[PDB]
Design a binder for this molecule. Structure first.
Ligand code: HEM
Length: 89
């Protein structure tokens, strides 16, 4: 169901590794923030754009293609989007 709690559970395990509290450890300022997305993200503040990054891996970010399920992928994207939009970073 591309759930946010699912998305969180994924995030917490998989993404937090580099992005702890939306907190990009590799490129300090390239955080999971709305603003940071809208500047740095190529594809803009769009679910498509988010998902695409997570799938395919981009710059210094690993690809999650087939490592996460489709729903899982969608959930983590949705969650990140919700966090950003809501400012729950
Ligand atoms: C876990 C599956 C995971 C998610 C979710 C995630 C999201 C994410 C987004 C949405 C961006 C864009 C942020 C912005 O535009 O400012 C992004 C960017 C980077 N990530 Fe990430 N990310 C997840 C996992 C990981 C892992 C495990 C690493 C660390 C090895 C990592 C690193 C990075 C880096 C670097 C970037 C910037 C690269 C770029 O977009 O050019 N991510 N991530």
């Amino acid at each position: 169901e591309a759930d946010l709690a699912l998305g969180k559970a994924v995030f917490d395990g998989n993404c937090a590794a580099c992005h702890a509290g939306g907190g990009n450890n590799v490129i300090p300022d390239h955080t999971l923030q709305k603003a940071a997305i809208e500047q740095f993200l190529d594809g803009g503040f769009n679910i498509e754009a988010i998902v695409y990054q997570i799938e395919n891996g981009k710059g210094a970010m690993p690809a999650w293609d087939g490592r996460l399920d489709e729903d899982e992928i969608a959930g983590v994207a949705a969650y990140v989007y919700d966090q950003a939009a809501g400012n729950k970073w």
